[PDB]
């Protein structure tokens, strides 16, 4: 699926998933053993950075709007990285538009 | 891509499509706001159908 | 996961469970649950020795139920090591299973056909088999007994006379037991499967360990024309809602744009009029509303980590 | 303070907290099904806190509900896994031996033989896989290359 995949966080391998059923949508990374769990609310994310396809690294960063919070995820397959990146882009853009509307009104 | 909407057009959409009104009334105050609802509706396959 | 993927996984599981031991089932089930799996990760997962893992991997590789992929990995703070990964190449595995099933069935059928033939003869001393035709030319001058050539001893009739029913029973049993594979192969033939590669399999990887030493990545060398045997295979939507103030502002902006457009296409001032005589060019209601509202209210009352990054 | 002891405030007791709270085959099956990886659960720590475990594990092995890795010196259950497949025993040794005897032909020649026998081959021979004086300079650094439209 496009809502889950393998990812590495803080040098720990695990599974990253995107929970959209519960509002607001949140991105949750769980280690393989389950000892480590991380959850980030996408409403806080300001910008979405991604490593170029011409580099051996498959990193993807989410910077939170304000010492701004920074979340880094490393992927294993470029196809998985792209499939996750498009889905994340959609949600980030929608949340930014919602914030813009709220501020304007 | 930018799409423009107005209050009159929103009312026309609700009048012409009762399903949209049904999904709007039960969700606008509960889960997400009207802008997010409209964006999701436009991105959804329901609008295409 | 596609339904054809599920079907082929079930076929592989059944074949391994039925035609192989238990450790084979463990290894192949691990490599089916996960994508390409490193040797160390497999060893840690199954808690089996290298010597024990050896025969299993070797037999599965000979049967082509598991493929191998060796690549050089360079840890940032350790000597590089060539790590071995194990995965399943579905087309090759399916072809091997199909061929082996056909061969087994053909072998049993040929054995039945051979057993249906006459028995033959055997020599107790030299333990030599003689067909009926070959024995017919060795009988003694008395036409009483068949004599061996090397031993000059009477021959003994061969066995397998009574197995005629046993072989048929074996075939009947085997077909029933092997029924599932045939149906799975029918569905597989109906569908089309794409050949798997190390990189492709990495896309479905479930990490075995939190800090597995093996780097589950495929970084091919640049401009490497070397070819190894059997190493190749065949928007954003934004919505804007308007209000009355925005409507009046929009009409005002449209009017301004029209004015700018007409100015852009308008003729210049010098061309508009003949400039001969010019010097040559060179260097209160609010209280009224309030009382209205009060009076109407009275009326109503009365009535009631720094690196390259790309923005996206 | 230790994590291996559970406190009961109803009576004020200190009870042992087993690693895997398993006291029934149903619990064992669900616990094995809940695993997110293929790492077996050790019988050494499963046996602790369970008066009998080998009997239940063998009962499930005969029923093909779980996969059991047994010791070599003597039959004794070790790390077990969930059996995602069917029956663990469904083919006779008389046929297993024939399967072992059958030897696969050369990889490059297998598809041709399968096609000759009328069976659709799901592969191809790898040999067939075809691999596949600038005049003005004061404007330098200004002109973008609109080469195509
Ligand atoms: Zn003889």
Curated annotation (Swiss-Prot), chain B:
The gene is TFB1. Signal peptide: none annotated. Present with 5150 molecules/cell in log phase SD medium. Disulfide bonds: none annotated. Belongs to the TFB1 family. It is found in: Nucleus. Residues 1-49 form the BSD domain. It comes from Saccharomyces cerevisiae (strain ATCC 204508 / S288c) (Baker's yeast). Component of the 7-subunit TFIIH core complex composed of XPB/SSL2, XPD/RAD3, SSL1, TFB1, TFB2, TFB4 and TFB5, which is active in NER. The core complex associates with the 3-subunit CTD-kinase module TFIIK composed of CCL1, KIN28 and TFB3 to form the 10-subunit holoenzyme (holo-TFIIH) active in transcription. An additionnal subunit, TFB6, plays a role in the dissociation of the SSL2 helicase from TFIIH after transcription initiation. TFB1 interacts with XPC/RAD4. XPC/RAD4 recruits TFIIH to the NER machinery. Interacts with the NER 3'-endonuclease XPG/RAD2. Component of the general transcription and DNA repair factor IIH (TFIIH) core complex, which is involved in general and transcription-coupled nucleotide excision repair (NER) of damaged DNA and, when complexed to TFIIK, in RNA transcription by RNA polymerase II. In NER, TFIIH acts by opening DNA around the lesion to allow the excision of the damaged oligonucleotide and its replacement by a new DNA fragment. In transcription, TFIIH has an essential role in transcription initiation. This is General transcription and DNA repair factor IIH subunit TFB1. The chain holds residues 247 to 295 of 642 of the full protein.
Swiss-Prot record, chain C:
One of its GO terms (molecular function) is RNA polymerase II complex binding. Residues 251-263 have a biased composition (Basic and acidic residues). This is Transcription initiation factor IIE subunit alpha. The gene is TFA1. One of its GO terms (biological process) is transcription open complex formation at RNA polymerase II promoter. SMART domains: TFIIE (SM00531). Keywords: Metal-binding, Nucleus, Transcription, Transcription regulation, Zinc, Zinc-finger. GO terms for cellular component: mitochondrion; nucleus; transcription factor TFIIE complex; transcription preinitiation complex. It is found in: Nucleus.
Swiss-Prot record, chain D:
Belongs to the TFIIE beta subunit family. It comes from Saccharomyces cerevisiae (strain ATCC 204508 / S288c) (Baker's yeast). The chain holds residues 165 to 327 of 328 of the full protein. This is Transcription initiation factor IIE subunit beta. Present with 1150 molecules/cell in log phase SD medium. The gene is TFA2. The lineage of its organism: Eukaryota, Fungi, Dikarya, Ascomycota, Saccharomycotina. Coiled coil: none annotated. It is found in: Nucleus. TFIIE is a tetramer of two alpha (TFA1) and two beta (TFA2) subunits. Recruits TFIIH to the initiation complex and stimulates the RNA polymerase II C-terminal domain kinase and DNA-dependent ATPase activities of TFIIH. Both TFIIH and TFIIE are required for promoter clearance by RNA polymerase.
